[PDB]
């Protein structure tokens, strides 16, 4: 509530429950190879 | 020397833990080698 940012980019999609925990940068391995990769220096929130 | 890492060979680190986590082992090895170089340079300064 007390930080400022240049811009906020929101990305939305749908996956199964088994893949929800895979959005973590380390856990991205299976998803990242073909579908969706989150940067190692990611700064933000993941909401599902 | 190992400096508490899964291996002491640099390339083995790059082919056994994947970029998301091998950075930690790389960092540990980096700190160990840098400390050793520090000790060598300080000994050299005193001897000089």
């Amino acid at each position: 509530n007390d930080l400022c940012f240049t811009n906020v980019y929101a990305d939305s999609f749908v996956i199964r429950g088994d893949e929800v925990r895979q959005i973590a940068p380390g856990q991205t391995g299976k998803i990242a190879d073909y579908n969706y990769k989150l940067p190692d220096d990611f700064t933000g929130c993941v909401i599902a | 020397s190992n400096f508490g890492a899964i291996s002491s060979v640099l390339n083995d680190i790059l082919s056994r833990l994947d970029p998301p986590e091998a950075e930690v082992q790389i960092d540990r090895l980096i700190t160990g080698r840098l400390q050793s170089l520090q000790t060598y340079v300080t000994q050299q300064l005193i001897r000089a």
Side-chain angles (χ1 to χ4, degrees), chain A residues 1 6-7 10-11 13 15 18 20 26-27 30 32-33 38 47-48:
Chain A
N1 269 6
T6 310
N7 288 300
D11 304 338
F13 49 84
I15 52 181
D18 275 3
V20 172
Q27 301 295 300
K30 282 166 250 195
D33 284 348
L38 208 78
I47 304 159

Side-chain angles (χ1 to χ4, degrees), chain A residues 25-26 37 40, chain B residues 19-21 23:
Chain A
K37 167 60 171 171
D40 295 340
Chain B
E21 287 279 5
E23 282 188 341

